[PDB]
Amino acid sequence: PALWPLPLSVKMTPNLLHLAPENFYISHSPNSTAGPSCTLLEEAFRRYHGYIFGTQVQQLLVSITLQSECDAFPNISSDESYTLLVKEPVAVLKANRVWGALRGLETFSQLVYQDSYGTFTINESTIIDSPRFSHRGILIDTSRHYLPVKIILKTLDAMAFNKFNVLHWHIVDDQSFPYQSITFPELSNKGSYSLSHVYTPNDVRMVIEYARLRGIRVLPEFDTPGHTLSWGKGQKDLLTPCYSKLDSFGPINPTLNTTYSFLTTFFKEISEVFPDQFIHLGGDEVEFKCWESNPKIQDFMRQKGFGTDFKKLESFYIQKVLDIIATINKGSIVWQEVFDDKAKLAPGTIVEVWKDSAYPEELSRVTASGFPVILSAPWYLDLISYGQDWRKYYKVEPLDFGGTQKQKQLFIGGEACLWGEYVDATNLTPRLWPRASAVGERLWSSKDVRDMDDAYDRLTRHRCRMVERGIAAQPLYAGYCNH
Amino acid sequence: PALWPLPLSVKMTPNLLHLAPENFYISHSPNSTAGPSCTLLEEAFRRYHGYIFGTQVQQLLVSITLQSECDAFPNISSDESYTLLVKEPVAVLKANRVWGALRGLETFSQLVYQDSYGTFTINESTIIDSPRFSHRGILIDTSRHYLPVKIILKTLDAMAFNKFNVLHWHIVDDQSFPYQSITFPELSNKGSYSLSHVYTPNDVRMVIEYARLRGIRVLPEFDTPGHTLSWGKGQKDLLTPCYSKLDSFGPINPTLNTTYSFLTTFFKEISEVFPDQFIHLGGDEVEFKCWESNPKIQDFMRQKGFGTDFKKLESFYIQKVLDIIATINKGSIVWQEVFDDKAKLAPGTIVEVWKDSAYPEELSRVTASGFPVILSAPWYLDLISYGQDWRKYYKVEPLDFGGTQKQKQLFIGGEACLWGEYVDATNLTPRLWPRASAVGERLWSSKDVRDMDDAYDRLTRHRCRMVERGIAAQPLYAGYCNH
Ligand SMILES: *[C@@H]1O[C@H](CO)[C@@H](O[C@@H]2O[C@H](CO)[C@@H](O)[C@H](O)[C@H]2NC(C)=O)[C@H](O)[C@H]1NC(C)=O
Ligand SMILES: *[C@@H]1O[C@H](CO)[C@@H](O[C@@H]2O[C@H](CO)[C@@H](O)[C@H](O)[C@H]2NC(C)=O)[C@H](O)[C@H]1NC(C)=O
Ligand SMILES: CC(=O)N[C@H]1C(=O)O[C@H](CO)[C@@H](O)[C@@H]1O
Ligand SMILES: CC(=O)N[C@H]1C(=O)O[C@H](CO)[C@@H](O)[C@@H]1O
Ligand SMILES: *[C@@H]1O[C@H](CO)[C@@H](O)[C@H](O)[C@H]1NC(C)=O
Ligand SMILES: *[C@@H]1O[C@H](CO)[C@@H](O)[C@H](O)[C@H]1NC(C)=O
Secondary structure, three states: OOOOOOOOEEEEEEEEEEOOHHHOEEEEOOOOOOOOOOHHHHHHHHHHHHHHHOOEOOEEEEEEOOOOOOOOOOOOOOOOOEEEEEOOOEEEEEEOOHHHHHHHHHHHHHHOEEOOOOOEEEEEEEEEEOOOOOEEEEEEEOOOOOOOHHHHHHHHHHHHHOOOOEEEEEOOOOOOOOEOOOOOOHHHHHHOOOOOOOEOHHHHHHHHHHHHOOOOEEEEEOOOOOOOHHHOOOOOOOEEEOOOOOOOEEEEOOOOHHHHHHHHHHHHHHHHHOOOOEEEEEOOOOOOHHHHHOHHHHHHHHHHOOOOOHHHHHHHHHHHHHHHHHOOOOEEEEEHHHHHOOOOOOOOOEEEEOOOOOHHHHHHHHHHOOOOEEEOOOOEOOOOEOOOOHHHHHHOOOOOOOOOHHHHOOEEEEEEEEOOOOOOOOOHHHHHOOHHHHHHHHHHOOOOOOOHHHHHHHHHHHHHHHHHOOOOOOOOOOOOOOO | OOOOOOOOEEEEEEEEEEOOHHHOEEEEOOOOOOOOOOHHHHHHHHHHHHHHOOOEOOEEEEEEOOOOOOOOOOOOOOOOOEEEEEOOOEEEEEEOOHHHHHHHHHHHHHHOEEOOOOOEEEEEEEEEEOOOOOEEEEEEEOOOOOOOHHHHHHHHHHHHHOOOOEEEEEOOOOOOOOEOOOOOHHHHHHHOOOOOOOEOHHHHHHHHHHHHOOOOEEEEEOOOOOOOHHHHHOOOOOEEEOOOOOOOEEEEOOOOHHHHHHHHHHHHHHHHHOOOOEEEEEOOOOOOHHHHHOHHHHHHHHHHOOOOOHHHHHHHHHHHHHHHHHOOOOEEEEEOHHHHOOOOOOOOOEEEEOOOOOHHHHHHHHHHOOOOEEEOOOOEOOOOEOOOOHHHHHHOOOOOOOOOHHHHOOEEEEEEEEOOOOOOOOOHHHHHOOHHHHHHHHHHOOOOOOOHHHHHHHHHHHHHHHHHOOOOOOOOOOOOOOO
16 A cells, blocks of 8 residues: 555545455456567566465456567666556556556555455555656666675666666776676686676676566666776776886776777677667766876877867767767767766767766756756765665755756656665665665656655555565664564 | 784794594593583584684694683673684683683684685684673664564674674663563563564573573663653553643653552563673663653652752662662663763662763763773764774774773773664664674774774675675675685
């Protein structure tokens, strides 16, 4: 009886219906673009029947209206709207695509409950729902700490329970390179913490398909030019050597052709491994020091007439990378610095705003320039604090920044980020849930859903539900669960 | 060979000795006051054999010098010192009491490591060790959230790995009364979150014996007169009705004869259930408004000539409870307010300093008045923050306050506290370890052990060892463990 996220339009009635575990079917409506050949739906039907059961409404008929997209990979443009008509003798779930059906199945399971005598019950009701924003993501960091594939899958399960639809996989960084590249086997061979802390091509396909079956996009992030210390272990001459030499290395060297030919071969591979339409190129916190200390780079700066402005060198670099992505049928997402340091961005390039200091203004600037924008700044869940910090994440109102409606339309969503300096398998799940659920509701539910007492009431029970489903979500406050 | 806490004296040699898993015995020296009939040692030998193994030193002989105390419960006066002589063919662990042997076994297990080829190895070495402080505790809160017995047992194991010797069990409080009382069945029947959220007499015995086998004291805290809301559900007319009329209640009513007869009977039961010599009476955050609003109490204040000074009414209450404890062969521990509010305490009453505003001065006052003191103030592990907060707990130097040497001798130790408003079985362990390990080394090791790099280096490996032993201790920073 606790809905989370709260659907767009909910109409409940005090009429009670009952379900019989051994005689309740989730089936395909005779009128549907999907049938038993639709693996995604067939698996969801079985999956949710187990989540639900561990007068009589004897069946839930599922009807997909338009071409189902059952065999496709979800996209930022995917329609996740759906309609739920709970009545006897047959309940009906209707949606334009399989994506909306997935969400509706989750909502339906949250409606079913057991009364005082253990009787499976559901109230007669009508639900009309659709997300406020299209990009609702969780960022995981598998470089600062390697995360076993199983916990990544458990995270995707929790994401589906919360209607998140994007897993921003910040797979590599300075400390380690777990991604196993087939065209460049020395990256992980030499950059991984160990050969037992790597993601084989199969581990990757596994995350991706498991995510697809839940309507979740897997956005890979291969951060450059900064945050690339671990890439140097296996790719010679990629990183920039620093000077008082020094045994220190800086960001990727943007003045070498070998750098671009390597990035060209590497991203062609990424374009073939990750089916998502987008590739996050990163571009955050590039340290200019080593570049400036390097003699050859000083000459390159002279030959290009960049003077002493290294943002131009950064821009030069990012623009060549951006161009490579553009030739491999992929879109690009970058951290705000790429935009702030005046790089020339092609239309459609998504900018992710992560810096907390006056981010509403950064939102105006980005959308003013006409670029799609994603907000993560107020949702750095790795920055833990004492108490109910879920309230501050919940209270955020993303569209509160100066701009026209056309500008506001460039805002496509946000992400709760769980960077890994202090996170691994021992503490990931409770740190992530239910704190991220606050971001989930703010990104899915209408802007007006803001009552804190009601939020607390539904979140408390949704958290217990996550625990009964095997997600070690931490408590909101003193209390207990009846599970 | 990552020792934690760092022993008092460690003399290491580069000579390597090796152990044969199938041919390595931990035995009673023929010269020892303990033998096979000593269950505590027999269980430890077995337990540590499994921890160690998941120029040959064939055996580790254990010699207890004075009366063993094998069948007793540990006490604040217990001698935990020991000596470890690691040499071939027989190593020797010698201690005055079994308590020191327990500590020695842990240290011995930390000296054994597997070399590059999986060979069990240990460096020839000599260790002389004893704790800097006698009271080294962890406070758990099973009221704000019920904790299944298994996580309490699990916590006791981690405490042993870290040389903690006191479990401060804040068993009840405002939100729930999990303790099952035989004399007062309704306290838990009506005050627990549910009947499946209680500690039966058997649950309590289990915690107590499991702790004893590890040289850990179980210190019970039944907080009064404040923090007693749940006690009111099953014991009528115990709590003070507040007025202004009001279906509202405050702390325990100190003016009724029924209160003291009830507490006399209740604490007699506690003195029989918990073998530890001390009972923590609590006494923190007593709100006076409810008392002030009660007519009958106002009368009592008049009859007693207390005027409008309710601290006198508080002192009155706690002094009577303190007297009850004194008549049942137990000592008392109280939160600082009892001392601060000028209650008359008998010699030997221990005062726990928990308020962090100028706690060093509070330490000065308490010891100046001649009372033993325990510090928890700077170690509130429930108050989480971003990053390596383990370092701030580690940097604390407890004896840095004004006082003579005699005053300083009254400081008997401290506790790392993990209050439960935001803690239950889903997040307790990773939140508690290795953060509490910092406090563990400050309370055990000498005052001069303060190098941060060395601490970081040993803690990091100690944390991996904890994970290996089944404790989901969270990471200190980026990295990995050689699983
Ligand atoms: C689902 O239906 C039940 C009715 O069977 C609703 O429960 C009733 O709630 C109202 C007001 O809260 C009470 O007056 C009734 O006593 C309840 N029913 C019973 C058992 O008599 C329940 O509120 C409905 N769900 C929602 C949220 O609409
Ligand atoms: C335990 O013994 C080993 C081996 O004698 C010590 O390690 C040697 O340390 C020296 C100098 O630090 C190195 O040159 C050797 O290469 C090491 N031996 C090995 C493993 O090849 C080790 O220091 C001793 N342990 C302690 C803490 O004293
Ligand atoms: C865009 C981004 O967040 N970059 C870095 C940062 O500034 O903070 C995080 C920790 O909070 C780090 O993990 C990231 O590497
Ligand atoms: C002595 C003591 O700590 N008393 C209260 C407090 O002030 O802080 C804790 C939370 O940090 C609460 O759980 C305790 O009930
Ligand atoms: C399918 O559509 C037809 C025609 O609109 C209608 O008569 C029939 O009742 C529908 N069947 C179901 C199960 O919805
Ligand atoms: C026990 O003590 C005796 C007498 O001091 C000594 O001879 C013997 O070696 C000791 N045994 C062991 C195993 O330490």
